[PDB]
Design a protein around this ligand. Structure first.
Ligand SMILES: Nc1ncnc2c1ncn2[C@@H]1O[C@H](COP(=O)(O)OP(=O)(O)OP(O)(O)=S)[C@@H](O)[C@H]1O
Ligand SMILES: Nc1ncnc2c1ncn2[C@@H]1O[C@H](COP(=O)(O)OP(=O)(O)OP(O)(O)=S)[C@@H](O)[C@H]1O
Ligand SMILES: Nc1ncnc2c1ncn2[C@@H]1O[C@H](COP(=O)(O)OP(=O)(O)OP(O)(O)=S)[C@@H](O)[C@H]1O
Ligand SMILES: Nc1ncnc2c1ncn2[C@@H]1O[C@H](COP(=O)(O)OP(=O)(O)OP(O)(O)=S)[C@@H](O)[C@H]1O
Ligand SMILES: Nc1ncnc2c1ncn2[C@@H]1O[C@H](COP(=O)(O)OP(=O)(O)O)[C@@H](O)[C@H]1O
Ligand SMILES: [Mg+2]
Ligand SMILES: [Mg+2]
Ligand SMILES: [Mg+2]
Ligand SMILES: [Mg+2]
Lengths: 317, 325, 134, 330, 418, 341
DNA sequence: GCAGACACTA
DNA sequence: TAGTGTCTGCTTT
C-alpha cells in the first residue's frame, strides 16, 4: 500500500508551503492574530490553494477544527435547499472558542455551485457573520457572484516560480533519497510550467519507472508540452519547416486535430509579437479550420492549409 | 468465445505482454505495478492505439478473480451526469478490501464527453479518495477535459503503432489461421494502416473472404487494393504524370479512365496525390500554398457533396495552375 | 439478458474471522431502521460490545444534522437471542472488547422493509468489514 | 402495381450488378459466423439498403425478421437518451431461439444485427455513447452503419466498423441491369438510350430506373409503337438542348453585360435547374479543344466554385449570372 | 475579531455613503408612501452591490416609522417546517400585510426568493401583483432591493433563456410590474470617489491608535486613494482597508474587479480603453472577464448598430464596409468564441486606425430587434386571421410566402374598392 | 367572389391554356395511377404547379378533389412547447402546410405522415415549398418514401430546388413547369376580359401586364385586378402600370444607394431594411431584387455591375449559412456603395 | 466608454 | 469663472 507522492508528501503546516512568500507570511500572521475574515482564493490549478486552506485551518484551530467544523467540498449534493439547511445549522452550534478564534466554513471548488446557493450563502453571512467565517477555494473569482466578493478580502495566488518548485523537489528527493541529475530536474521544471502537482507526478513516474532522474528518461516518458510546440510552429519562418515540425511533433506523436486547433487558438490569443491585423487574420483562419474540423473534415490537409494561409498572411507577398 | 467474433474483438490482448508498439508505456506501467503504486494513470492517444485493451489487461493481471467485484467499468454507454458521479462513483470509491488489499481501479473510458460540473465533481473525488482508490481516465481529445483534471492525473501519450508492431501483429494473425501474405501486400498494409490496429484487422478479415480458397493461396497487392478500394500507387503516379505533361484533354481522359476502370473515389485520390506530392521539392512556396489551399477547399466541397466530374476537373486545374509558379 | 453476464461475483465472506455475531428479533430492528430513515442520518454506526456480567451492548447510532442519535437496542434475552464478540478467530470469545462499524445509510435503507415482516434477524460481520445479514 | 424502383429492388445477394467486392465478402460470410461491423458509404442510390436487406434475408429469414432485427431511422425520435436506452436494451437481449424449420432451411447465425440508416445525420454524442456498446457488447450482436457522408461519421466509428465502399454505378456498371429491366418490362431502345440514361444519371441506378419508367409510360401513352429515342429521355431528364447551350456560349463570348443579363433572365424564367446547365457547360468547355490551358484552369475553378455555391442551397439565378459574367470576362 | 464594516455601521443619515440627490428623491418617495393614499404602492431599488441600497432605507425607517425601527425583512432561509418555498413568500406577504395601523412595520425584501426553477420563477410575478390592485384600506410601505449582478456562465443550460444570463430587475420582473403606475424605480450608482475618500478618512482617524502602531500612517493616503478610485463598493473598500491595516506590509492588495456593463463593453470595443494602451491585452482581459456576454447574441448586433456613432457617421465608407463584411463573415461560424474574437479585434483595429478623426462621437442605441419581432408577430397573427376569414367562404391555398409577398398589399387594395 | 386567382381557375385537365407538352406528359403519368412513382415539381414561382397537381389528382381520383376540411392538430416537441398547425385536409389526399418553423419541423412531418400512412388504394401528400427544410425534414421524407413506398405518394412543388438534397432528387421524378410566354398570358387575360365583358380599347395594356409580371400568372392577374377596380372596370392605354409598395421601396432604396454613398445613407438603408424585414419575409428574394435593381441603372458601367453581381453572389452564399440576414444585407449594400464611390 | 446637464469651489 | 467631479441614459415574449 504505497501512498502516491501527491498525497504522501502533501504539506501539513504552512511552513512547508512555498511559491508565494508574501501570501504564506500573511496567512501565518493572520493565524497568529486569529482575526481571519472571509476570503476568496483563486488561481491556476495545482498551485497549492486547498492544501493551504486546510493547513491554515489546522494550525489556526487544532482540535476544534478537527472535531467541530463542517467542511463541504464538490463531492456533495450542492442543491439550494440542502446547502441552505446545512450551512444554517452549521452557523449555530457554538462552543467555548477562544476570543480570537472563529469557525471556518471551508468551501472547495465553489465555481460550479448554483446561484441560488450563492444567495443563500449571502443571507447566511449577513445573518450569522459574528459567529462563523467563510473560506473559499476555487480557480477563478469570476464564477463567484459580485455581492459575495464585497464581504471578503480576495487573495490571489501567483504562479509558482522555478526556484520554489526546485526547492520543493530537492526537499522531496532528500526525503526519498533518490539520485537525480540537474538536467533531469531542469527538464522536470520545464515540463511542469509552474504546476507543482504535475512536477510531483512526473518526478514520481521517473523515479518509479527508470530510477535515476535524468533528462533523457523524462523526455522518453513524457514529451514536450504542446503549447510550446504550437507556439514554435506559428512563429516558424519557412512553410516547409512549419509543416515538418507539425508532422513530426503532432501527427507522428498522436495528437488530435481539434486539440491542435484549440492550442493554436490559445497561443494566438496570448501571443504578443504579432501585429493586431496579423493576430486577427490568424484567429479568423483558426476559426475557419475549427468549423471545418467540427463539420467532419478532420484530415491533415486542413491543418496544412491553415499553416499555408497563416504563412501567406504573415509574409504578405 | 472464439471463431464466432469479428477479427477486431478476436485478437484483443489479455495480458500486458500482448500489447505491442507502446513498449515504453508497458514497461513503465509494469514497473509501477511491481513497485506497488498506481499514480492515477491517464491514457491519451488516437483511436486504435489500444488504451482500453492495455488498461483492461493490466487490471486483469493485477486482480485475477477480483475483477468482477473490485474493478468498476464506466463509459458513455451508461448515464454519466452530476448525480451519477455524485452517488455511484462516491459509493464505489469508499469501500474497503474483501480478499486482497490491492488498490481500487475505476475505468473512465471516453470520459471526454462529461460535463464541466461532472468533471469538477470527479476531480474532487480523485483528490479526496486517492489513498485507496486510483482512477484511470481514457480520452481521445484533451481539449474537452478540465485542465485541473490533467494536473491530478499522470498523462501517458499513446503513439500511433509503428511498422514493427503492425508487422508482428500481422505475423501473429497469419500464424494462428495459417494464411500466407505477400511482402508487397505487407508493405501496402503498412502504408494503409496509418497507426490503426482496427483498420488492419478489419481489412484482413475482409481479404480472407475475398479469396475463393481460404488456404493454399497468398494475398497480393491486387487483392488488398480491390478489397478496401484504395488506389494503387502506380495509378496515382500515372495520373500525376498525365496531369503534369498533358494539359486538359488526354489528362482528363486518363483520369476518367482510371476512375471508371475500378471505381476509384475522388477523396482517396486526393490523399494519394498529396502523399506523392509532399516529398516534392518546390522552392517557391507559393505553389505549395496554392496546392494546399485549393486541395483543402476541394476536399471540403466533396465532403459537402457535389458533382464528381466538376471536382475532378477542379483538382486537375488547381494542380496545373499551382505548378505554373 | 445473457450477453455480458460476467458470472462469479458474490460479496461473500469467510466464517473463520467473524468479528461478532448477533441474533435479534425483526420487530425490534424494524423500529430502529424506521426511526433511522425519516430522521435522516446519512452516516450510521454499528456498535458491538460484550460484558462479563452478561450486559451486552449493541446499538445502531448515527450522526446527522440533528446531532447525535443513539438508538440503543435492548440487551435482555427476551428478543436478543445471542450476542458474542470474537477476536478474529470465530472461536475465542472475549469480553470487554468493542467493535465499531461505519456503514452508509443507503445500505441500511434496503434492509428496513426486509425486516418489516420477519421473525429473527442474524447479524454477522468479519474483520474485513463486510456484513452479512440473514 | 408498384413503381420500378421498389418492384425491381433486389432480394438476393447475387442480383447486384456492380458492387462485387462487398457482395462476395457477404456471400463468403454466409457460411461463417464472424460477420464484423460494416460501414456502408458511397454515392446515393448505389443499393446499400438493398444490399443489407438481401444479406439479412439470406441470413435470418422472414421468421427471424421480427425477433433478431432492429432498424432505427430518422422517421422517429433520435435523441441521445432515447437512442441510448433503446440500443442498450436491444444490444443486451439474449440470443433468440429459432425453430427447427429455420435451422433446417436457412443458416441461422448465433448473433443479431442492428441496422442504423442515415447515420451521417446522427449527433457526435450519440456516436460516442454507442462506441462502447458496439465494442464490448459485440459478442452476439453486430451494428451496421449506412451513410453517404463519411466525414459526418467520427473517427472512432470508422475504426470499429469495416469500411465497405460502394462504387458509383456508372454506365458499364449498370448496362446489363438496365437491359434486363428493359427485357422484363418490354422497353425498346434504338441505339444508346440506356447508356444515355446512365450518362445523365449521377452514378446512380434509381434515378435511371425512374427515367426509364417515365419514358416507357410516355411511349405507352403515345401508342404509335415506335422505340424511345435519346431526345425523349433528354427532354424528360431536364437536359438542356445543344442548340440552347451553343446560344448561351455564343452570348457569353460577346462582351456585353445587358444582353447577357437579359438572356439569363429569359433562361431563368423557363425554370430550368442550374446544376444541369452548369454540368453541360463544364463538359462542353472541357471537351472543346479551342481553348488554352490558363483559360481552362480558370473556368474550371469558377465552375467548381459555382457548383459548391449551388449545392450550398443558394439562388440559381444569381449564381448562374455571376458564373456567366465571370466566364465572359476571362 | 470583528469586521470593520460591521463595527463602523452608520448611526445617522449624515454617515451613509449616498449622493444628496439620491437621498432627497428617496426621502420624498418614502414620505408620500406613508400616507393613506399613495401614488406609488411599492418601491423598487435596483443597483450594484454595496451602494447603500438597504442601509439607507434602514435609517429611513428608523426616522419615519415612529412618526405614526420597525422593519419586516423577509428571510428566504426559513423553510417554515412543512411549507414549500413557493408558498413561503406568499405567506410572508399576507403575514406582513396586517400591519397597516399601530405597528406600521416597513417591508424590506432584500433577500428575494431564488427564482431559477420554472414553477418558482413564474410565481414571483403575480404574488406582488395581487398585492397592488387589492382594494383594501390603508397601505404598509414595501421596499424591494435587487442587486444588479450578472450570473456567471454555467454548463448544460439547454435553451439558455433570460434571467439566468444576468440577475437584474429588468430580467426577472415582467412588463406589467416594470411600468406599473403604482411603482417607483429608483436606480442606484456606485459610491463616488469623494464619498469613499471621506469615509476612509473617518475610518483612519477612528483607528488612529492601530494605524500609528505600524509604519502605515505615512503610507495610508496612497493606499486609501487607490482603493477609492479602483472600486465603487464601500464594503469592499472597508474590507480591503482592514486587510491592509492588519497586514504587516509588502503585500499587494487585491480588489473584486467587478464586471463591466453591456454599453460599457460596446464603448470599449468601438472607442477604446485609456487604462490599457495595448490592444491585445484589453480584449484578452475582457474575454476572461465577461465571456458570458460576448458569447451571446445581440452583442454583434449592438456592434453593428453603434459603429456609426464613432464620428457621427463621418468616417471611411471603405472601413465601414470592411467592418460589416467582417461581422457578416463572423456570423457564419455558428456563434463560436473564435468568431467573436475576430470581429471585435477587426472593429477595434479599424477604429484605432481611424482614431485621429474621432474628436466628436455620438450616442449608442441598443438594437431594436424586439420591436421587429413584435411587428413580425402582429403581421403573423393578422395573416392567420386573414387566412381564417378567407377560407370560410371559398378555397385559397398559396402558402405563407405568397401571402406576405403578393397578398400583403394587393389583397387589401381589392377589398378597399369593394 | 373575390379574385380571378381562384374564381376562373382551370377545373378540368382539358382547360389548360399553357403549353400542351407538360399536359401530355402528366396525362401519360396519370394513365396508370397504380404505377405512378413519387413526383417532384420545380419551376418559377407563380407558374401554377399546384394547378397541375390538382389537375393530376382530378385525373386520378375524380370529382371532389377540392374540399375545404379545415382541421387543427396539436404537436409536442422536446421538453414542453405546444405547436399549432392549420393543416388542410381533403378526401384521398392531404396538403402539408410549411408555415411551421424549420427547427421544430421533424415532429409535425413525422406524426402526420405516420397518420396518413397507418397500415391499410393510396392517399397522396402535397408538400409545397420543400426548400425551407433544414435537411432533417428532408431525411425524414426520404426515409418515409423509401420504407413505406406501398401506400404513400409524395408530390412536392418548389422553386429553385438546389437546397433539396441529392437523395430526394434521385427518388422523385422531375417535372419541369416553365413559365408561359407573353402570348399565352395575353390570351388568358383576353379570355378573362371577354368572360366579364369589361371595356378594352387597346390590347397593348394586356401585353404590358404580361411582360411586367415576368411571366407570373398570379402577379399578372392581380395587377389586372388592381387597375380594373380603380378605373371603374374600364382599362385605358394611358393608364400607368402600377406596382406594389415592395417594388417602389426597392427602387427608392436602389436610387438612394446610387446617388448617396455615405454612412448616414447606410443607416437610412438599415432603417429601410428593418422596416421591410418586419413583415416575416426571407432575405434571399430581397437580395435578388436589390441586385437586379442595381444592375438596371444605366449610369453604371460593366465593371461596377460585375463587382455588384460578384459580391451579391458572395453575400448570398454568406446568407445561406448565416443565422441572421441584416449582417449580409448591410455588407452587400456597403460593398455596393464602396464600388460605386 | 461617451453625450447631455448640474453641483461647487477653486 | 473654467475646470474637475459625477447623475441619466443608452434597453424586450
Ligand atoms: N507550495 C507547495 N509546496 C509543496 N507542495 C505543493 C505546493 N503547492 C502544491 N503542492 C502539492 O500539490 C498537490 C495538491 O495541491 P492542491 O492545493 O490540491 O492544488 P491546487 O493549487 O489547490 O489546485 P486545485 O484547484 O485544487 S486542482 C499536493 O501533492 C501538494 O503537495
Ligand atoms: N498494441 C496492440 N496490440 C495488439 N492489438 C491491439 C493493439 N492496440 C489495439 N489492438 C486491437 O485493437 C482493438 C480495438 O482497440 P481498443 O483497445 O479496444 O480501443 P482503443 O485502441 O483503446 O481506442 P479507443 O480510444 O477505445 S476508440 C483491440 O481489441 C485489439 O484487438
Ligand atoms: N447493384 C444493383 N443492382 C441492381 N439494382 C440496384 C443496384 N444497386 C441499386 N439498385 C437499385 O437502386 C434502388 C435501391 O437503392 P437504395 O438502396 O434505396 O439507395 P441507397 O443505397 O439507400 O442510397 P442512399 O440511402 O440514398 S445514400 C432500387 O431501385 C434498385 O433496383
Ligand atoms: N458610511 C457607510 N455607508 C454605507 N454603508 C456603510 C457605511 N459604513 C459601513 N457600511 C457598511 O457597508 C455595508 C453596505 O450595506 P448595503 O450596500 O446597504 O447592503 P446591500 O446593498 O444590500 O449589499 P448586497 O448587494 O445586498 S450583498 C453594510 O454592511 C454597512 O454596515
Ligand atoms: N393552364 C392554365 N391556364 C390558365 N391559368 C392557369 C393555368 N395554370 C395556372 N393558371 C393560373 O395560376 C394560378 C395559380 O397559380 P399557383 O398554383 O399558385 O402557382 P404556384 O404553384 O407557382 O404557386 C391560378 O389562378 C390560375 O389562374
Ligand atoms: Mg483543491
Ligand atoms: Mg476504449
Ligand atoms: Mg437507403
Ligand atoms: Mg444591505
Amino acid at each position: 500500500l504505497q501512498l502516491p507522492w501527491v498525497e504522501k508528501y502533501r504539506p501539513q503546516v504552512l511552513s512547508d508551503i512555498v511559491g508565494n512568500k508574501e501570501t504564506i507570511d500573511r496567512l501565518q500572521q493572520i493565524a497568529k492574530d486569529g482575526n481571519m475574515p472571509h476570503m476568496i482564493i483563486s488561481g491556476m490549478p495545482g498551485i497549492g490553494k486547498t492544501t493551504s486552506v486546510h493547513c491554515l485551518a489546522h494550525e489556526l484551530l487544532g482540535r476544534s477544527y478537527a472535531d467541530g467544523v463542517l467542511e463541504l467540498n464538490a463531492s456533495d449534493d450542492r442543491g439550494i435547499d440542502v446547502v441552505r439547511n446545512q450551512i444554517k445549522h452549521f452557523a449555530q452550534k457554538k462552543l467555548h472558542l477562544p476570543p480570537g478564534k472563529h469557525k471556518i466554513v471551508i468551501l472547495d471548488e465553489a465555481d460550479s455551485m448554483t446561484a441560488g446557493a450563492q444567495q443563500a450563502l449571502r443571507r447566511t453571512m449577513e445573518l450569522y457573520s459574528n459567529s462563523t467565517r467563510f473560506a473559499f477555494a476555487c480557480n477563478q473569482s469570476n464564477k463567484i457572484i459580485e455581492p459575495l466578493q464585497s464581504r471578503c478580502a480576495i487573495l490571489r495566488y501567483s504562479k509558482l516560480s522555478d526556484e520554489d518548485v526546485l526547492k520543493r523537489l530537492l526537499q522531496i528527493i532528500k526525503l526519498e533519497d533518490v539520485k537525480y541529475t540537474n538536467d533531469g530536474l531542469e527538464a522536470i521544471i520545464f515540463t511542469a510550467e509552474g504546476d507543482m502537482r504535475q512536477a510531483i507526478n512526473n518526478l514520481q513516474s521517473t523515479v518509479a519507472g527508470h530510477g535515476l532522474v535524468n533528462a533523457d528518461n523524462v523526455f522518453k516518458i513524457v514529451d514536450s508540452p504542446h503549447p510550446l510546440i504550437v507556439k514554435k510552429m506559428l512563429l516558424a519562418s519557412n512553410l516547409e519547416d512549419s509543416i515538418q515540425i507539425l508532422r513530426t511533433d503532432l501527427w507522428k506523436k498522436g495528437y488530435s486535430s481539434i486539440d491542435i486547433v484549440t492550442t493554436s487558438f490559445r497561443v494566438t490569443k496570448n501571443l504578443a509579437q504579432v501585429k493586431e491585423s496579423v493576430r486577427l487574420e490568424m484567429i479568423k483562419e483558426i476559426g475557419l479550420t475549427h468549423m471545418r474540423i467540427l463539420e467532419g473534415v478532420g484530415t491533415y490537409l486542413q491543418l496544412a492549409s491553415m499553416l499555408a494561409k497563416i504563412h501567406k498572411l504573415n509574409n504578405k507577398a | 468465445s472464439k471463431e464466432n467474433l469479428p477479427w477486431v474483438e478476436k485478437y484483443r490482448p489479455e495480458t500486458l505482454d500482448e500489447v505491442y508498439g507502446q513498449n515504453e508505456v508497458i514497461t513503465t506501467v509494469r514497473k509501477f505495478v511491481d513497485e506497488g503504486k498506481l499514480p492515477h494513470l491517464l491514457f491519451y492517444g488516437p483511436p486504435g492505439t489500444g488504451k482500453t485493451s492495455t488498461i483492461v489487461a493490466l487490471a486483469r493481471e493485477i486482480y485475477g478473480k477480483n475483477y468482477s467485484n473490485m474493478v468498476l467499468e464506466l463509459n458513455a454507454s451508461d448515464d454519466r451526469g452530476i448525480d451519477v458521479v455524485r452517488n455511484q462513483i462516491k459509493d464505489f470509491a469508499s469501500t474497503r478490501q474483501i480478499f486482497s488489499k490491492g488498490f481500487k481501479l475505476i475505468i473512465l473510458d471516453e470520459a471526454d464527453a462529461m460535463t464541466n460540473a461532472a468533471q469538477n465533481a470527479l476531480r474532487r473525488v480523485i483528490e479526496r479518495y486517492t489513498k485507496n482508490t486510483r482512477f484511470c481516465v481514457l480520452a481521445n481529445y484533451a481539449h474537452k477535459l478540465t485542465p485541473a483534471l490533467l494536473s491530478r492525473c499522470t498523462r501517458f501519450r499513446f503513439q500511433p503503432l509503428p511498422q514493427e508492431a503492425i508487422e508482428r501483429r500481422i505475423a501473429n494473425v497469419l500464424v494462428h489461421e495459417k494464411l500466407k501474405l505477400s511482402p508487397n501486400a505487407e508493405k501496402a498494409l503498412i502504408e494503409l494502416s496509418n497507426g490503426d490496429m482496427r483498420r488492419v484487422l478489419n481489412v484482413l478479415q475482409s481479404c480472407k473472404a475475398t479469396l475463393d480458397n481460404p488456404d493454399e493461396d497468398e494475398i497480393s497487392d491486387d487483392v488488398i487494393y480491390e478489397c478496401c478500394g484504395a488506389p494503387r500507387p502506380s495509378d496515382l503516379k500515372a495520373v500525376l504524370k498525365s496531369i503534369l505533361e498533358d494539359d486538359w484533354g488526354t489528362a482528363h481522359y486518363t483520369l476518367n479512365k482510371v476512375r471508371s476502370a475500378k471505381g476509384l473515389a475522388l477523396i482517396d485520390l486526393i490523399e494519394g496525390i498529396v502523399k506523392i506530392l509532399e516529398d516534392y521539392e518546390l522552392q517557391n512556396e507559393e505553389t505549395r500554398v496554392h496546392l494546399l489551399t485549393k486541395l483543402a477547399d476541394i476536399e471540403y466541397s466533396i465532403s459537402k457533396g457535389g458533382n464528381d466530374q466538376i471536382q475532378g476537373s477542379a483538382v486537375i486545374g488547381a494542380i496545373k495552375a499551382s505548378f505554373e509558379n | 439478458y445473457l450477453i455480458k453476464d460476467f458470472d462469479t461475483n458474490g460479496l461473500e465472506l469467510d466464517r473463520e474471522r467473524i468479528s461478532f455475531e448477533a441474533i435479534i428479533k425483526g420487530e425490534a430492528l424494524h423500529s430502529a431502521l424506521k426511526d433511522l430513515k425519516e430522521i435522516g442520518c446519512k452516516e450510521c454506526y454499528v456498535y458491538a460490545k460484550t460484558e462479563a456480567n452478561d450486559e451486552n451492548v449493541f446499538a445502531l447510532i448515527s450522526k446527522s444534522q440533528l446531532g447525535f442519535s443513539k438508538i440503543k437496542l435492548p440487551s435482555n434475552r427476551s428478543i436478543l437471542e445471542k450476542l458474542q464478540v470474537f477476536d478474529g478467530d470465530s472461536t475465542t470469545v472475549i469480553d470487554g472488547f468493542a467493535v465499531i462499524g461505519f456503514f452508509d445509510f443507503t445500505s441500511f435503507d434496503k434492509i428496513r422493509k426486509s425486516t418489516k415482516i420477519a421473525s429473527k434477524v442474524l447479524f454477522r460481520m468479519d474483520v474485513h468489514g463486510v456484513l452479512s445479514v440473514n | 402495381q408498384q413503381p420500378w424502383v421498389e418492384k425491381y429492388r433486389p432480394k438476393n445477394l447475387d442480383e447486384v450488378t456492380a458492387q462485387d467486392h462487398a457482395v462476395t465478402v457477404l456471400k463468403k460470410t454466409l457460411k461463417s459466423a464472424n460477420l464484423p461491423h460494416m460501414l456502408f458509404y458511397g454515392p446515393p442510390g448505389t443499393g446499400k439498403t438493398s444490399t443489407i436487406l438481401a444479406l439479412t434475408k439470406e441470413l435470418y429469414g422472414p421468421d427471424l425478421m421480427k425477433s433478431r432485427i432492429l432498424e432505427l431511422n430518422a422517421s422517429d425520435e433520435r435523441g441521445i437518451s432515447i437512442v441510448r436506452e433503446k440500443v442498450k436494451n436491444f444490444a443486451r437481449l439474449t440470443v433468440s431461439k429459432p425453430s427447427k424449420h429455420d435451422l433446417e432451411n436457412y443458416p441461422c447465425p448465433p448473433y443479431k444485427i442492428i441496422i442504423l440508416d442515415e447515420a451521417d445525420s446522427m449527433t457526435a454524442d450519440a456516436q460516442s455513447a454507442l462506441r462502447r456498446t458496439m465494442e464490448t457488447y459485440s459478442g452476439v450482436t453486430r451494428f451496421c452503419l449506412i451513410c453517404n457522408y463519411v466525414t459526418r461519421i467520427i473517427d472512432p466509428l470508422a475504426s470499429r466498423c469495416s469500411k465497405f465502399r460502394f462504387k458509383a454505378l456508372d454506365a458499364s456498371n449498370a448496362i446489363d441491369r438496365l437491359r434486363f429491366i428493359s427485357e422484363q418490362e418490354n422497353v425498346k431502345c434504338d441505339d444508346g438510350v440506356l447508356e444515355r440514361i446512365l450518362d445523365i444519371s449521377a452514378g446512380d441506378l434509381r434515378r435511371g430506373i425512374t427515367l426509364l419508367q417515365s419514358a416507357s409510360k410516355g411511349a405507352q401513352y403515345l401508342g404509335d409503337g415506335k422505340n424511345i429515342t435519346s431526345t425523349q429521355v433528354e427532354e424528360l431528364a431536364g437536359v438542356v438542348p445543344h442548340d440552347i447551350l451553343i446560344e448561351i456560349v455564343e452570348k457569353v463570348k460577346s462582351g456585353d453585360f445587358d444582353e447577357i443579363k437579359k438572356y439569363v433572365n429569359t433562361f431563368m424564367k423557363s425554370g430550368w435547374s442550374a446544376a444541369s446547365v452548369v454540368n453541360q457547360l463544364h463538359e462542353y468547355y472541357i471537351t472543346n479543344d479551342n481553348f488554352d490551358t490558363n483559360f481552362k484552369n480558370q473556368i474550371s475553378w469558377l465552375l467548381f466554385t459555382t457548383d459548391s455555391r449551388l449545392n450550398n442551397g443558394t439562388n440559381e439565378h444569381i449564381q448562374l449570372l455571376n458564373l456567366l459574367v465571370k466566364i465572359s470576362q476571362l | 475579531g470583528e469586521q470593520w464594516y460591521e463595527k463602523f455601521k452608520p448611526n445617522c443619515l449624515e454617515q451613509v455613503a449616498i449622493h444628496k440627490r439620491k437621498l432627497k428623491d428617496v426621502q420624498e418617495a418614502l414620505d408620500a408612501m406613508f400616507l393613506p393614499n399613495a401614488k406609488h404602492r411599492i418601491l423598487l431599488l435596483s443597483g450594484p452591490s454595496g451602494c447603500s441600497k438597504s442601509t439607507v432605507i434602514k435609517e429611513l425607517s428608523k426616522i419615519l416609522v415612529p412618526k405614526y425601527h420597525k422593519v419586516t425583512e423577509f428571510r428566504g432561509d426559513c423553510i417554515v417546517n412543512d411549507l414549500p418555498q413557493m408558498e413561503s413568500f406568499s405567506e410572508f406577504l399576507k403575514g406582513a400585510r396586517y400591519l397597516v395601523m399601530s405597528n406600521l412595520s416597513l417591508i424590506l425584501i432584500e433577500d428575494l426568493p431564488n427564482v431559477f426553477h420554472i414553477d418558482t420563477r413564474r410565481r414571483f410575478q403575480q404574488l406582488i401583483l395581487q398585492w397592488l390592485y387589492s382594494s383594501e384600506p390603508l397601505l404598509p410601505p414595501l421596499v424591494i432591493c435587487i442587486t444588479e449582478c450578472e450570473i456567471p456562465e454555467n454548463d448544460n443550460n439547454y435553451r439558455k433563456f433570460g434571467i439566468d444570463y444576468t440577475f437584474s430587475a429588468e430580467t426577472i420582473m415582467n412588463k406589467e410590474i416594470l411600468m406599473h403606475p403604482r411603482l417607483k424605480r429608483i436606480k442606484f450608482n456606485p459610491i463616488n470617489s469623494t464619498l469613499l475618500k471621506k469615509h476612509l478618512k473617518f475610518i483612519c482617524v477612528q483607528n488612529m491608535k492601530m494605524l500609528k502602531e505600524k509604519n502605515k500612517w505615512n503610507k495610508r493616503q496612497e493606499v486609501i486613494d487607490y482603493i477609492a478610485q479602483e472600486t465603487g463598493d464601500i464594503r469592499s473598500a472597508i474590507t480591503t482597508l482592514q486587510f491592509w491595516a492588519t497586514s504587516s506590509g509588502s503585500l499587494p492588495i487585491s480588489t473584486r474587479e467587478s464586471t463591466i456593463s453591456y454599453f460599457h463593453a460596446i464603448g470599449k470595443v468601438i472607442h477604446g480603453s485609456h487604462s490599457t494602451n495595448n490592444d491585445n491585452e484589453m480584449i484578452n482581459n475582457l474575454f476572461e472577464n465577461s465571456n458570458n456576454l460576448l458569447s451571446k447574441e445581440d452583442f454583434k448586433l449592438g456592434i453593428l448598430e453603434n459603429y456609426n456613432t464613432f464620428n457621427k457617421g463621418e468616417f471611411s465608407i471603405s472601413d465601414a464596409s470592411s467592418i460589416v463584411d467582417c461581422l457578416s463573415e463572423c456570423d457564419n461560424m455558428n456563434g463560436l468564441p473564435e468568431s467573436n474574437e475576430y470581429g471585435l479585434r477587426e472593429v477595434r483595429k479599424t477604429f484605432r486606425n481611424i482614431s485621429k478623426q474621432g474628436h466628436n462621437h455620438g450616442t449608442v442605441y441598443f438594437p431594436r430587434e424586439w420591436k421587429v419581432r413584435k411587428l413580425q408577430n402582429s403581421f403573423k397573427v393578422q395573416a392567420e386571421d386573414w387566412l381564417n376569414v378567407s377560407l370560410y367562404k371559398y378555397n385559397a391555398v398559396h402558402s405563407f410566402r405568397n401571402i406576405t409577398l403578393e397578398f400583403g398589399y394587393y389583397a387589401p387594395l381589392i377589398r378597399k374598392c369593394q | 367572389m373575390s379574385l380571378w386567382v381562384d374564381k376562373y381557375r382551370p377545373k378540368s385537365l382539358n382547360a389548360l391554356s399553357h403549353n400542351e407538352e407538360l399536359t401530355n406528359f402528366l396525362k401519360s403519368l396519370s394513365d396508370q395511377p397504380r404505377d405512378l412513382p413519387h413526383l417532384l415539381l420545380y419551376g418559377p414561382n407563380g407558374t401554377g404547379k399546384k394547378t397541375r397537381c390538382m389537375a393530376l389528382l382530378e385525373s386520378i381520383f375524380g370529382p371532389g378533389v377540392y374540399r375545404l376540411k379545415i382541421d387543427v392538430r396539436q404537436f409536442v416537441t422536446a421538453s414542453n412547447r405546444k405547436l399549432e398547425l392549420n393543416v388542410v385536409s381533403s378526401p384521398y389526399h392531404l396538403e402539408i402546410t410549411p408555415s411551421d418553423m424549420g427547427n421544430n419541423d421533424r415532429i409535425v412531418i413525422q406524426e402526420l405522415l405516420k397518420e396518413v400512412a397507418q397500415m391499410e388504394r393510396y392517399k397522396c401528400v402535397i408538400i409545397n415549398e420543400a426548400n425551407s427544410l433544414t435537411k432533417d425534414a428532408q431525411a425524414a421524407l426520404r426515409r418515409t418514401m423509401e420504407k413505406y413506398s406501398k401506400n404513400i405518394r409524395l408530390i412536392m412543388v418548389c422553386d429553385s430546388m438546389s437546397p433539396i438534397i441529392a437523395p430526394i432528387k434521385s427518388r422523385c421524378l422531375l417535372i419541369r413547369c416553365p413559365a408561359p410566354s407573353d402570348s399565352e398570358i395575353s390570351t388568358i387575360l383576353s379570355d378573362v376580359v371577354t368572360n366579364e365583358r369589361i371595356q378594352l380599347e387597346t390590347k397593348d395594356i394586356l401585353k404590358r401586364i404580361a411582360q411586367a409580371s415576368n411571366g407570373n400568372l398570379r402577379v399578372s392577374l392581380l395587377m389586372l385586378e388592381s387597375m380594373a377596380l380603380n378605373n371603374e372596370l374600364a382599362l385605358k392605354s394611358s393608364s400607368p402600370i402600377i406596382k406594389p409598395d415592395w417594388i417602389i421601396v426597392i427602387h427608392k432604396l436602389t436610387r438612394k444607394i446610387v446617388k448617396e454613398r455615405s454612412v448616414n445613407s447606410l443607416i437610412e438603408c438599415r432603417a429601410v431594411l428593418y422596416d421591410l424585414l418586419a413583415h416575416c419575409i426571407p432575405a434571399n428574394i430581397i437580395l435578388k431584387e436589390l441586385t437586379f435593381s442595381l444592375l438596371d441603372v444605366e449610369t453604371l458601367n460593366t465593371t461596377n455591375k460585375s463587382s455588384i453581381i460578384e459580391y451579391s453572389s458572395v453575400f448570398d452564399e454568406r446568407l445561406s449559412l448565416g443565422n441572421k440576414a441584416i449582417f449580409h444585407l448591410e455588407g452587400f449594400i456597403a460593398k455596393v456603395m464602396c464600388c460605386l464611390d
